[PDB]
């Protein structure tokens, strides 16, 4: 499984 | 920078002429990933050769690898043709099978 | 007694074709067994190896999720990173990451792993602590930054020390007949005149899985490491490796020469010479 996506926005580099 | 790509042309199993088998050209240490490889019989491109997904190795460089089913004989010459931003013009790589 | 899990990530813009294009690939080991890409016809993470079959719908779904979430995302990180870079709108350019966990034979996070590059180039990566992180450059640092305020080591860890420990122990169990089987390799030597007076020996390990093993040849007991050429371990297409170790050896001395092989498939490591 990858990583889960956070509650919020995902962050951009 | 750009890394150019290593080639090896070989087979699945060991080649026995009159007998079916799989053709494999395996591409390795590149960087850009565009890369187009085609895999020949006498000189003329095979139809339906597929290949892995993209994936990479530690120093990021790419690796793939074309394959299809193929009977090998004593004359047929099969060889794996490369072209890469790296590269002037394509590259061929005739198929040793004691390589 | 060995066993990891990575993701593979590789974004690619590529101006006047299009918006940029996201692949992901997972390996338990050298066993890939799933994939995602943007450009297919109707992106969704499919199976790549026979036991992540039996995954049910929420687990593709969930799948599916993140990595078309990471591909708009990864959209934005290649125009930002441009941007760090003060470079033209002109060029295709790469954003690479690779994360996952490794397992002893004694369960447990062993160490966890989180690096991306850009063009080729380290750019960042997760200290091994699982709580900081280790900027190449200027460039790197706004990200950084940005990650530190996002608590994205935290996630990071939560998610290597939990979530990815469990997954990996789940498919070692459901694929055990394949990735707990270590496969020996068939081996031979093979002798190929090249003058007179020298021959080549090569050494042949054919159909091994893992990939990991060590091929060398010694002369009178004494490794010929400066004198072999050995070539990258390569896929068969089935699973399987193959890999070669030549030497060429002054004809009538062949028998001063030793092939070992060394591989988990084994009950013990081989000493193999050339059988005229």
């Not at chain 3, 994939?35 to 016809?41: E, G, N």
Request: a negative charge.
């Amino acid at each position: 499984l990858p990583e889960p996506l956070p509650q919020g926005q995902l962050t951009a580099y | 920078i750009q890394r150019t790509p290593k080639i090896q042309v070989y087979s699945r199993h060991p080649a026995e002429n009159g007998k079916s088998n799989f053709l494999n050209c395996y591409v390795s240490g590149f960087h850009p990933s565009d890369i187009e490889v085609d895999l020949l019989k006498n000189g003329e491109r095979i139809e339906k050769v597929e290949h892995s997904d993209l994936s990479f190795s530690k120093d990021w460089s790419f690796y793939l690898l074309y394959y299809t089913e193929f009977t090998p004989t004593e004359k047929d010459e099969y060889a794996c043709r490369v072209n890469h931003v790296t590269l002037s013009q394509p590259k061929i790589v005739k198929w040793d099978r004691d390589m | 007694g060995s066993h990891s899990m990575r993701y593979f990530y590789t974004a690619m813009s590529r101006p006047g074709r299009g918006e940029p294009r996201f692949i992901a690939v997972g390996y338990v080991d050298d066993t890939q067994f799933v994939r995602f890409d943007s450009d297919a016809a109707s992106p969704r993470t499919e199976p790549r190896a026979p036991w992540i079959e039996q995954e049910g719908p929420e687990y593709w779904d969930r799948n599916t999720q993140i990595f078309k979430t990471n591909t708009q995302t990864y959209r934005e990180s290649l125009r930002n990173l441009r941007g760090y870079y003060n470079q033209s709108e002109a060029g295709s350019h790469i954003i690479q990451r690779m994360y996952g966990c490794d397992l002893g034979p004694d369960g447990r996070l062993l160490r966890g792993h989180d690096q991306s590059a850009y063009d080729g180039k380290d750019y960042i990566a997760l200290n091994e602590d699982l709580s900081s992180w280790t900027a190449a450059d200027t460039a790197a640092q706004i990200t950084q930054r940005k990650w530190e305020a996002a608590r994205v080591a935290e996630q990071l860890r939560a998610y290597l020390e939990g979530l990815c420990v469990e997954w990996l122990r789940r498919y070692l169990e459901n694929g055990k007949e394949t990735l707990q089987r270590a496969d020996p390799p068939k081996t031979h030597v093979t002798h190929h005149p090249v003058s007179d007076h020298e021959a080549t020996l090569r050494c042949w390990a054919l159909g091994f899985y893992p990939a990991e093993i060590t091929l060398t040849w010694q002369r009178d007991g004494e490794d010929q490491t400066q004198d072999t050429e050995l070539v990258e371990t390569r896929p068969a297409g089935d699973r399987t490796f193959q890999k070669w170790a030549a030497v060429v050896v002054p004809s009538g001395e062949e028998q001063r020469y030793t092939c070992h092989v060394q591989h988990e498939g084994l009950p013990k490591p081989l000493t193999l010479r050339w059988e005229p």
